[PDB]
Write a protein that binds this ligand. Sequence first.
Ligand code: CLA
Ligand code: CLA
Ligand SMILES: CC1=C(/C=C/C(C)=C/C=C/C(C)=C/C=C/C=C(C)/C=C/C=C(C)/C=C/C2=C(C)CCCC2(C)C)C(C)(C)CCC1
Ligand code: SF4
Lengths: 34, 41, 87, 80, 63, 160, 142, 30, 732
Amino acid sequence: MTASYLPSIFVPLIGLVFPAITMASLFIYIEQDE
Amino acid sequence: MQDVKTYLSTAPVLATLWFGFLAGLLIEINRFFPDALVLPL
Amino acid sequence: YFDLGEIDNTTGNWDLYGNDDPNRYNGFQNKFFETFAGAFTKRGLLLKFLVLGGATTIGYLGSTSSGDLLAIKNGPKQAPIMGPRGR
Amino acid sequence: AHSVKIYDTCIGCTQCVRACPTDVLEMVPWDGCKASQIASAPRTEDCVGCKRCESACPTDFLSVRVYLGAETTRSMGLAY
Amino acid sequence: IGPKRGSIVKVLRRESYWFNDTGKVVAVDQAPGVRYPVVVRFDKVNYAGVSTNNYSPDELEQS
Amino acid sequence: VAGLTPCKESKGFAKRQKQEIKKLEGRLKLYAPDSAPALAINATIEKTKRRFEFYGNQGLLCGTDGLPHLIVDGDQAHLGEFVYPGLVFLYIAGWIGWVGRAYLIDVRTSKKPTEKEIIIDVPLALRIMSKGLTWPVAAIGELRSGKLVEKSSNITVSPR
Amino acid sequence: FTPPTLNADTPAPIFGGSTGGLLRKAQVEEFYVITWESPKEQIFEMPTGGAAIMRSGPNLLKLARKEQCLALGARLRTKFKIQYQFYRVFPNGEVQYLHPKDGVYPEKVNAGRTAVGVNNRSIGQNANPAELKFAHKQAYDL
Amino acid sequence: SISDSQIIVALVSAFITGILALRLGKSLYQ
Amino acid sequence: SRFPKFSRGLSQDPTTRRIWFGIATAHDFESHDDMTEERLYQKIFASHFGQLAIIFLWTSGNLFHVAWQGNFEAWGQDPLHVRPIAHAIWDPHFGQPAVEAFTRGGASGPVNIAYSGVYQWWYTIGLRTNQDLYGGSIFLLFVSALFLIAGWLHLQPKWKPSVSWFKNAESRLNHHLSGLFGVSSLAWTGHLVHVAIPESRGEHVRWNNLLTALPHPQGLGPFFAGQWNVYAQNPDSNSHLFGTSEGAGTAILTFLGGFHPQTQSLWLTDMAHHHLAIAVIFIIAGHMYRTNFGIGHSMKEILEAHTPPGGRLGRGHKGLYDTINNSLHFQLGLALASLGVITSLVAQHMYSLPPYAFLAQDFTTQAALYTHHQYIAGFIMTGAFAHGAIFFIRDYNPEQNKDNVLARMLEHKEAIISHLSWASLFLGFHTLGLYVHNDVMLAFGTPEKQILIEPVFAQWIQSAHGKALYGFDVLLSSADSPAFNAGQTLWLPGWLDAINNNSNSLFLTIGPGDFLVHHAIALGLHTTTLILVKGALDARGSKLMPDKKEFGYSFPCDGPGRGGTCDISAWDAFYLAVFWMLNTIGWVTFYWHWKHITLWQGNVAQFNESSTYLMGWLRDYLWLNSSQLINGYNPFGMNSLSVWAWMFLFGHLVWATGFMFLISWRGYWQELIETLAWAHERTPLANLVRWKDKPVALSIVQARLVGLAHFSVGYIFTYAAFLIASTSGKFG
Ligand code: CLA
Ligand code: CLA
Ligand SMILES: CC1=C(/C=C/C(C)=C/C=C/C(C)=C/C=C/C=C(C)/C=C/C=C(C)/C=C/C2=C(C)CCCC2(C)C)C(C)(C)CCC1
Ligand code: SF4
């Protein structure tokens, strides 16, 4: 390991934040009346 | 026997009587000629 | 039970547990909450700083955590276990 | 919603209408059978798609034919 | 019209269960405008359980 | 053939005969020598010794597992493993297939053809079960005369 | 045929209440009202689940689906000799009369209705989907 | 072993690739 | 116009099905509304570019994780005693035993051990340090970025290509055979010769010294003068250690055959010659069809002219060129049929002839790499057959295919389905009866009473290859054959030494258990082919329902009338044959993993005595090898196989969860969700919350798909876990 702290950053974002970004933006998108 | 033998000629009874005779024959072949892996004739 | 003068009362549009009381608090408690929760009102604004603020707050304590706080930042504390065939 | 189509093999036996649980089919006059009547589907937007008419059609192959297409709240059979 | 009543016909209709099957004609409708006048009875039922079906004379040949 | 020793000279096949009687002899140690269950194990041992002396005398091939292997290629040494009981089988299986085919032709030209299959007409059945003895001469005879196969114009075919 | 007008003054059958009745689809989308004339006070099986005492005069029953009106309607057409009609009621107040459209039930033929959705060909003369690629029409609607 | 600054070069080039993936997904939408 | 916008009929659906089907009809581009030919082919072309970008952005992250968190240099120093590290683990849910137990390969933290064979591959090809893998990851980031730019570019109206460019099959085949298969295998050969052979011989050849490091002592002189044997003059000896200069040769294109004696793997000089041969023959084969220059072939007239004059094939292949060129599902089915037969040829030829250095010694990696390509190939082949069914519904024109071979497949389709049915029934009664018979004889205390059939046809083929174990001595095992004397100075000194060795997996010693499981394999392929040929040929219609083509491909049923029409569609035959490919490849990889798990620890007699009956398969393979699998975590503690012990149990969840969708069907759940909708609409404090999508049960096709996908995920995870825990915990 070169940078041990990027495991501590990207695994919380792509594991928690990015599904919370993607599923909330999709649920807005799939329930748009348009 | 115009209707008793008709019941005896039905599909489940004739399957029981044939396979009773068939498994009866193949068991009795497997008594006098057991462990038969190769036909000698 | 069909009326043709009140279409909501004959279809199930009932406030079954609602109340028509106008207010039950006082003015001192009401002015405190609307002042503090005034920057949290708009849905488009609140969704922006909750995503951006939520991404920072999980990356902060994910990185500033210690060995006793989380075991993944503690690392190994013993000799490694050698597998079979010398691997 | 669902598209119910009647073909010219129909004998006017009326049992497709009698098997219909959402009042889609009706018997209109016709000149192509002994019964002098054929089925039709004017209220095909009310069709759930259950194909009870196809189960009750004695013509080989079927004269009433239900094609499951776009499904709405009529053809989903919901009460909520 | 029709081949004959009480005759043996073979069905040329592709979508019938009794395609290339021997059937017996029981009724031919002589009224004009009827698309499928020949009523053919079969010894075997279809999946619906019926054996009576109406065919045009163009979908049958004498066999 | 195929790297397999014969079972009469296989040391692994004789090892399995030794450890099978020894398993049955140790079962015999807890019974009286004239008792009824000891006669069954004594008949089991003589059934085992008859079996191993039959497998070695037929020219069976034994591998490294001490087990008799069958050569089904059609070897002149190995005819009774697959070819001889296969021709015995196909004669019997063709007998089943010929008397069931000839029964359906005999009941298709009847008043109620579906009541003769749930209720099988035994005088009609037994008069052709004897006739299934000579069935290669009757199947290829019907094949050469064209009565075995049906023309495709009279066969129910699903549409394209 | 003049369609019958919903009176909205005839009363309901004596029913103890059910949980199979009108949900929020009645409130925002549609609900169905079936009206029929009765000989006497009988007991019928509720299509939502249960039993109710139906009145000796005209009856009004509120249902959620069109299938509940035919399941009730064919029940009181075979067990009872009662002619029935039902409606479709929308939340804005519009009542859409639905069945029978000509006043006579669709099992019996009427000269007023016309053939719609009727193909002059059979199933075997329907076109293949390969020669109808990328079109609004399909193999059966032409 | 690779260095710290090479991880920065990879993360920018993946973010540039993530923009070009976002640009194709907009064009696949239209 | 709600989601989904490509289908107008699903946008007016007020239920949850609109949310579901829009995910699943997302890539079915030809079923979309207001949809044309040009938009179809351009969206497919940009989807291909996105697929290429995903593959290259995948490889970039599988290279970045080896270069960053993996010990590729430490594995390069000692590839026999170092476990290859895939990537590091950052799990907030580990306790201290899990951090202390997943730290393998001399790493600083908990890491995942790579069982994908990427270290063996990158070592054999020439990559040595982490900086080379990082440079490859940046280069393939650039390549995926270029493919995203090209995918966006061809959707722009200036660079949109027309359908006539897309349906240009002759130019596509010439530039695929010449460029994709020829100049890329000649590019490869230039790598294997310039980089991989000198890195096997210790010379560090990179981009900085590409123009100075000469690959041969006399480079490009004997090539253009004709004496090519100078490139096969001094091969690597049997004392050659891989990656070191000692014991090495100078020849770049040898024809030795067999294996490198230290790695038990193929020679890089042979694979370089192999690629120069499948490069000359593909560039020459790419000058076949007519594009722009007068010479060449028109494939329409090839297919028109290939009619037998006796009329046994009808019109032959007349009208098939327009049939393939107009139908994208025909081309995709042909591509997936060829791809399944070569992904299975990949699987069969990387275990028996290991192509990568120190891949044969790493056992669980080889097991993963066989099971990978046999499952990916049993889903690619089923996709081929399913696309044949979709071609027969939405793309097959009976007017254009009039009495050709493709129409004559529909003319005698009942003969094909009934004879596949006979072959499947034959194989099933015979294989089940022989296994159950051998089970009864091992149960009844008599192992000698088994019907054991020596597979003498395939043993004769092995003796035809050069195996002297069976003593057939016909050709290449006898010195009196002309094939042997034509080969004994050319490739056979390597091949016979590789095939007469009993430690490798090159043409293993087969027995009666191998015969029986090969009939299990033939049962699996025959019954999967039965269901799939039955789905493809009854796709348009059948005697139960003649208008299956007018109901689409994946329609649920046709109603309870006419006896009952459940699973009548061709998608449902694909659905029923996914279970048969799972069973088939389960049998295949059971046979592979047990034939190899007994070979690797030496006792092949366990397989030779126990594979003939199914209690040996249950006890000595499924129960015996699962000893350290399910003991990956205990009440006493947890081992390094614990993630493989959870993933095993996880598979038994998901697979069994599929049963919930495959046994229980819709209307039970629809009435259940009706009661749930009443309960939510009447509960105080929760009635305030509404749904916009009406809650419905999963629809019937969706139910079969969800149960099938759960069945497949559980099936691949139960076996990925067992197979990567019963070889990597008991190495050997
Ligand atoms: C990759 C996915 C991901 C990751 C990073 C985590 C991370 C975590 N899990 Mg979690 N989990 C996930 C997937 C995820 N989970 C899923 C899919 C399952 C379902 C099967 C679970 C089920 C599960 C449960 C049941 C629990 C955990 C808990 C934990 C914590 C264990 C570490 C610890 O001791 O902290 C101890 C706790 C803390 C240090 C508290 C920190 C809480 C912070 C401050 C929240 C701050 C706001 C937040 C960031 C807003 C997010 C916004 C959005 C954009 C994501 C940690 C926060 C445990 C826990 O304590 O949860 C918090 C616990 O009870 N997990
Ligand atoms: C020389 C010119 C040239 C070359 C290089 C290509 C290149 C390509 N074209 Mg193209 N094409 C050309 C001109 C060219 N074409 C012409 C003139 C026409 C006009 C009619 C077309 C029209 C055309 C269409 C319309 C499509 C393509 C597509 C593609 C791609 C094929 C899919 C892919 O990447 O699989 C890569 C495949 C290989 C590298 C071949 C591998 C063969 C087998 C399967 C594997 C064997 C390899 C080996 C064993 C594996 C070892 C590696 C392992 C260690 C990892 C590929 C990039 C498709 C695409 O993806 O679009 C982006 C597409 O949609 N092209
Ligand atoms: C339905 C359909 C389809 C599909 C189908 C499929 C999918 C199929 C498959 C098939 C397959 C998948 C097959 C394969 C085959 C192969 C083969 C057939 C092979 C062979 C080989 C050979 C013959 C060779 C030879 C040899 C040998 C053997 C040895 C030595 C060497 C040599 C080389 C000499 C399609 C799409 C078209 C469309 C239409 C319809
Ligand atoms: S809905 Fe289900 S049970 Fe009913 S016919 Fe279709 S598949 Fe069969």
